[PDB]
Structure formats: C-alpha cells, structure tokens
Amino acid sequence: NAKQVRWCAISDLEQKKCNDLVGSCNVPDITLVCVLRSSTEDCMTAIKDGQADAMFLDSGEVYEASKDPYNLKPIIAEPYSSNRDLQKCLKERQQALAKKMIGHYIPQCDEKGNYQPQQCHGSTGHCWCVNAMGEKISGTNTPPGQTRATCERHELPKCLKERQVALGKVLGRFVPQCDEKGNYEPQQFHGSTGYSWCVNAIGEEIAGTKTPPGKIPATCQKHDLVTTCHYAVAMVKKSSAFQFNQLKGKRSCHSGVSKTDGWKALVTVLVEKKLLSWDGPAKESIQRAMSKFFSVSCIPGATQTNLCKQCKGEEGKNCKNSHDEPYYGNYGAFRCLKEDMGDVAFLRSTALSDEHSEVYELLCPDNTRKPLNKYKECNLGTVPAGTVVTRKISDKTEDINNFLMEAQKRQCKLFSSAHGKDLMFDDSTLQLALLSSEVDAFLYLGVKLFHAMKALTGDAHLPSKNKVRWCTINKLEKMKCDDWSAVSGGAIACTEASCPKGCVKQILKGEADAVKLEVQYMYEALMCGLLPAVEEYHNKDDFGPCKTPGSPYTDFGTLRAVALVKKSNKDINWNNIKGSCHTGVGDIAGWVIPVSLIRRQNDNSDIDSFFGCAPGSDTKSNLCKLCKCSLSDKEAYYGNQGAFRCLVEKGDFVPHTVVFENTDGKNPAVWAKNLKSEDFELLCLDGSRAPVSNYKSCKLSGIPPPAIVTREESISDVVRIVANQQSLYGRKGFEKDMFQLFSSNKGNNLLFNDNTQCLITFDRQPKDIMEDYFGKPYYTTVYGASRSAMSSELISACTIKHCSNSLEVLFQ
Numbered sequence: 001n002a003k004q005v006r007w008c009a010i011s012d013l014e015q016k017k018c019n020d021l022v023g024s025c026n027v028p029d030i031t032l033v034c035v036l037r038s039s040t041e042d043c044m045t046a047i048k049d050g051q052a053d054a055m056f057l058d059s060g061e062v063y064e065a066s067k068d069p070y071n072l073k074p075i076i077a078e079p080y081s082s083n084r085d086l087q088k089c090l091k092e093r094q095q096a097l098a099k100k101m102i103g104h105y106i107p108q109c110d111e112k113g114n115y116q117p118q119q120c121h122g123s124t125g126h127c128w129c130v131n132a133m134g135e136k137i138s139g140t141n142t143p144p145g146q147t148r149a150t151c152e153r154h155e156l157p158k159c160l161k162e163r164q165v166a167l168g169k170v171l172g173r174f175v176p177q178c179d180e181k182g183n184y185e186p187q188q189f190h191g192s193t194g195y196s197w198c199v200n201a202i203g204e205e206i207a208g209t210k211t212p213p214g215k216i217p218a219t220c221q222k223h224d225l226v227t228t229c230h231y232a233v234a235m236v237k238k239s240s241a242f243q244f245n246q247l248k249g250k251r252s253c254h255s256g257v258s259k260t261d262g263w264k265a266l267v268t269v270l271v272e273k274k275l276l277s278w279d280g281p282a283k284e285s286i287q288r289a290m291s292k293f294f295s296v297s298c299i300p301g302a303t304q305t306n307l308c309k310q311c312k313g314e315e316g317k318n319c320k321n322s323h324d325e326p327y328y329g330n331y332g333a334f335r336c337l338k339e340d341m342g343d344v345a346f347l348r349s350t351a352l353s354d355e356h357s358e359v360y361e362l363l364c365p366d367n368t369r370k371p372l373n374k375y376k377e378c379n380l381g382t383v384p385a386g387t388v389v390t391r392k393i394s395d396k397t398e399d400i401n402n403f404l405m406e407a408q409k410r411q412c413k414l415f416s417s418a419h420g421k422d423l424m425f426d427d428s429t430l431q432l433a434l435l436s437s438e439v440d441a442f443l444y445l446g447v448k449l450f451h452a453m454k455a456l457t458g459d460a461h462l463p464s465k466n467k468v469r470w471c472t473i474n475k476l477e478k479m480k481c482d483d484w485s486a487v488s489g490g491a492i493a494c495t496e497a498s499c500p501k502g503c504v505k506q507i508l509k510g511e512a513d514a515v516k517l518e519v520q521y522m523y524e525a526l527m528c529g530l531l532p533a534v535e536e537y538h539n540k541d542d543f544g545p546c547k548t549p550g551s552p553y554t555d556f557g558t559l560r561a562v563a564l565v566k567k568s569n570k571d572i573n574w575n576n577i578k579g580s581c582h583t584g585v586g587d588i589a590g591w592v593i594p595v596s597l598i599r600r601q602n603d604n605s606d607i608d609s610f611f612g613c614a615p616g617s618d619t620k621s622n623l624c625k626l627c628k629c630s631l632s633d634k635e636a637y638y639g640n641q642g643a644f645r646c647l648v649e650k651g652d653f654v655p656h657t658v659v660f661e662n663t664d665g666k667n668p669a670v671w672a673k674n675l676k677s678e679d680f681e682l683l684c685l686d687g688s689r690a691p692v693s694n695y696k697s698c699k700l701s702g703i704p705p706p707a708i709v710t711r712e713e714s715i716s717d718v719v720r721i722v723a724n725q726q727s728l729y730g731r732k733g734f735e736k737d738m739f740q741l742f743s744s745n746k747g748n749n750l751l752f753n754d755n756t757q758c759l760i761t762f763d764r765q766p767k768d769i770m771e772d773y774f775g776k777p778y779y780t781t782v783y784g785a786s787r788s789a790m791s792s793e794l795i796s797a798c799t800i801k802h803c804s805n806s807l808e809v810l811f812q
C-alpha cells in the first residue's frame, strides 16, 4: 500500500524546499517526508542509522560515503550524453511522451528509429535541424511563419567517411578499423606498414603510442565522447593581480572541504605544481597543510579555525556543511568573493554567467588569467555529476527511484526553488536516472578517479613486490588459499570475493593482485587494462614445458569447439543445418562459438527460426522441445554428455574430448556403450566430416586457456613468485608432500582446475593484446575483432570520458 521516502535536509532552506514538494508534488502511494539535520555528514549518518533514506552528494563525497562510518551507495544520478548511445531518438521520444504535461517538445523519429532531420516543437511552431544524435545544427531554428532551414542528413560518422576517402586511386595510405555504428577502434593497425597506434574518441592519435612493427603495441583505453561537462575553476576579480603560483598566503573561499570543485581538485593541482608543502596523508592531514597555505578562509566543514575565519554563519552554524552557512556551496563561495571576504573562489563552472564577465575572471593553473567563457581551457579538472545515495543494503532503493521518476514525470519542481539555488539537487540537473545495482563508489567514479580519491584520503595501498594477494571466489577457495599462504613463507596472501568479476574489480581497486579467469571473463579484464601473467597448461601427454620453463610446447591442452554428427548415417553438412542440440546456453563450445558463426555468416536471428535441445533457452521454443530444458543437472540433455545423448536421441556442438569420452565402451550406459569412434565425426566449414581425429584442423574454433591476470606493473613479480612457488609445490615439486597447487582435500578445482599440468608464463607477442590472448579466430568470431563487441558497468568504469561541446564533430 502506502510507502514513504524520507529525504534528509542539511539546512533550513533545504527543508523549506522539501516541505514545498511534500505539499505540491503528489506521487500516488508514496509519501515524501523531510528529515532535518545540520550538515552533510549528519545527513549521511542519519541515512546510515535508518533515520532517513536518500540524499544528494557531490561526486567528491562518494568515496568517503562508501566507507565507515557511513557505508552509503550511489543509486540515482543524472545521465550524460555519449557518442555510444543507441536508439536515442526512440528513447527520448518515450520519455517525453511519459511526461504528464501538454505542449512539451516530443522528438520525432522515422521508421528506422533515427531522428528526422527536421525537428519541430508542435506547441510553438519552431523548427530546426539535427544530426544523427539529435543535436541542433547551429542557427537553423526558425519561428512559425518564416522560411524554414532546409535540413541535410548528418548520419555518417567521422571514421566511416575516412574509410571511403582512403579506399578512394590505388594509393597505399592507411585505412582505419572501426566498430559498428562507425566509432573509432581505440587500437589502430596500419595495413601497409606493421605500425600500431591509438586514438581518442574522434580518431586522432593520442601521443607516444605509435610503435614499429617489431615492438609490443601500447596498451590503450576505450574513449567515449561526452557532452556538457562541468569543471572546477578558480574565480578571481579583475582588480587583483596575483597568479596561481602566488596563492600561498591569500584569502580563499571554497564551496566545501569534501567537494571536488571546492577542495579536492585544488589540492591535486597544488601538489602537482609543487606549491603545497605536504608530507602525505599518513604523516599530516591535508587540512593542516592547507591551513598553513592560506591565511584566512571560509571552507565549510573545515576543522582548522583559520580555514573557518572568513565564514559568515551565525554561531552554531558557522562553517557548517549547510546552507545555514551563507558562504556554503558554489554560489555561497561566489558571495564571499563578491563581498571581498576572499581573494579567490573555488567553485563549479555552473556558477559562471555572462553577467559576471565584467568584474570577474578565471585564475588558470598555468599562471595566467582568462575570461569566464574560457573555463574549458582554464580549470582545475572535470567534475562528474553528483548522485543520490542510500545505504549499501539498498532496502529502499525501489521506493526512492519510483518517487523521483514519478515526480519527474509530473513536472514537480525538483531542480529549482525560490528559496535558493542548489537545494536538494544541483540546479543544473536536467534529469535523474536509476543506476544498475552493481554500481558502487568504484564503478560510479571510475578506476582512475577512484584511486585519486583513495590516495587523497590516505587509504592508498602500495603492493609488495615480494607478496602476491590471491583472490578467491568462495569459502572453499579461501580455505585452500589459506593452506597455500601458510606454506608460502610470506609469498602468498588471500582475499575474498563472491565471483570472478569481483576479483577483477579488487585487482583494479588495488585490493588484490592475481586471479585465474575462464574465457568468459577475459574480455572485460583485458578491456580494463589487465594482462595475463601465467596460464593453465592442460597437455597431460607432454611434460617438457612444465619440467623446464621456456622449452617449447606442441599442444597447450586447449579444447576445440566442434560439431559432432554420424558419418552419412545422416547426410548433413554445415550449409544445411537449418531444421542441432547444444550443451548449454552459456557454454563456450556448446553455444558461444557456434552462435557467433551462425549470426556472422548470414545476419539474422538465432534465438529461434534457424534450427528445427539447448538448455536455458526459454521454453515452448524451437530447440527446448527436443530435450525440462533447464540449465541444470536435472535435465538429462545438459552438459557435455547430455549433448551427446541428444545426438543419439533424435540427433541432428561440443568440445572435441566429449566424443572420445563415453565412446569405445568408456561410459557404462544402456545407450552410449556400444558406439565407436568410427560412427561419429565432425563438421568443418567447406571441408566437413573429418574422422573426429582430425581436430585442430576440422574445428569451429580453438578455445584459449584459462589465464591468471594482474596489473601491468605486477606482471614480472607475479610470474616470478608463481614460478618459484611452482618449483616448490604442485606437480613434481620439491616440497609437494607439504602442499599441492593443483589438488586439495578442501575441494575440487579450487583456484585452478585440478587437471592443470602446470602454469606457463604468458609469451606476449607484438600484436593486439585481444588478439594476443584470444587468438585471431576466436577474437574475430566471438567479438568481431572489436573493442565494442560488449559493454558493461565495469568496462564503462575503465573507459576514459573525453569532453566535447557537442558530438557534431563526429559528423563533419
């Protein structure tokens, strides 16, 4: 029935606005309640205690909020416009139609879902022109009763036109590789010359990343072009004459001690410019070093008296993280500078307006001054948007989201008030969208910014070059790793995660050093800059590579994905497979490799309508009938052998080893006992029906081996410690009676697969690391040889956001 959402207010003005929303905003079955506290930190505590449910935090406060004594988590935030947004016109049309208002602009889309080149605001009669991303072409807005601008289609991305400008007069210049939708691949390979280099979002080469053919190519990050960026700036009056390197001793006003635009961006610049004498957060609090840097200041929330001297709040509210302090916030910091209580104001660029351009200007970190409109060139760094937070337990996230989504639909005045600016939310907020429940402080801030916040609060870990922290995914692995650590002589330590993805995050966060990953997780890990140090070797026939490291191997023990049929017992070939059964929807050989080939050779729909048992593929489906159909042992057609039972029972895609298993009498069953290796064989493309013994040639694809990944700067140490530990323990080790790497009484396949022969150091080749790990057939088949084949919250956190006024640049 009726639920309630308790919003926390840090000030009297915020409670006045919040109570206005309680009266004027009617959301059915949700009741808004306003809880009052005296500061930002007291509101975070109230949410932690269950006294309130939601509040809005600056991005600079997200990291500290995620820890004791707050333990808060971002749930709702304003989305930015990226150059990777799909079906944007359709989504934007739905949102506008969802608004409970009449006469608002509703974007117009064609049949394909693209923007119509001309967009009109029906209620006002104004029309304008737009590119493929919906951005208004400058100057094309016309009122009713006036000749309209004629609108061209701007649908050709920047790269795709460069392909056919270089494809041309039989020249020899280079052609770029770009993923679908025309975006530049971050890694570029020159066809004529073995050179490799890397580009940003708009395809221009970054810098020192070009490499000759014989050398290892650079490790290069995915870039995204994002619009509307806000910046941290230092604002000063034109009357003053000092520059940035003369800030010491001056009077300053800051939006807040915990805010990026008021403190954290400034401290980063002061340290990099060597203007701030600071030993470090372990030796000295950053506030103490800053207290000696400035003479007197107003920095709301500060615990040094001189940093609170210039504040204007009445006693009990002076220097508080609250609008009760008149100088709090971006506009509060501007007010102090206006009233000559400080010589410089540190605030967000959103508080800049052309009205201030007469008296005010910007203080640039290169010791120059520039006008306000040059803030994109005169700033202390980008500031990501704030976010709504709640408890990590996330008990009331659903109720909080339903309220804000409904309040936005009903045009409630969330982002403005007569009482003041930036109350409850940033006034610049256009909309708030729900975040994935996977998102936390690390994923929201991103890998680079997270470490900057971690280092700034003195939680930065420095890994020991002589110890490897190994991440586990369950209690049994933790027990075996503890057994390993106790016999490692300080070389091995153990961390705990719930899944391999969590282990990858811990390595990126600096909380762990190494983990073994199956093939499914390698795409994200390699995308985030991790690298394989050692890999599981499974060739039980050859021991040369294990006994002596560096000696070559003939077969790494890889599985090969193949399609097994009987020899003309059935007359099937690859080209008439329409009208087979698979191990499982998630398995690589059973599903990933075949389905990737199918969709690649004729762009269509595999989900159904291509075949005439594939567990985990819904029910009442084309294949789920042949099996019920659960991705579980309880289905008798699940797994490697389960897919073998399907080939014999109404047979029409498995690893190569499965046929040799059960055959020749190996599996005691009523069905698969009296069949032999001459009865079955495999489908190759265009070749077909090799005697199942010609795999490695009659294969759909090879499957790369499991890899142990780590950071690039930890590669040499991890392999060194693993190699030393492998000589002691594991198969044929000096102290193998003390402990075993590839077997355990705690369980099976802990940390590594128990059938692993040994770990072999990864031989890196002068090739793309995605190709270098996966191999060209697997990389091309499964992921299209592209860095954009899959997207996720983890990959987004590992993606560099590159600011641009508009996406327009990608179209001309």
Ligand SMILES: NC(=O)OC[C@@H]1N=C(N)N2CCC(O)(O)[C@@]23N=C(N)N[C@@H]13
Residues within 6 Å of the ligand: 535, 555, 556, 557, 558, 704, 705, 762, 763, 764, 765, 771, 772, 773, 774, 775
């Ligand atoms: N075939 C094979 O099994 O490869 C063994 C080992 N492991 C890989 N995942 N690779 C990726 C591709 C590759 O070149 O085959 C190899 N690449 C390097 N640096 N060592 C090889």
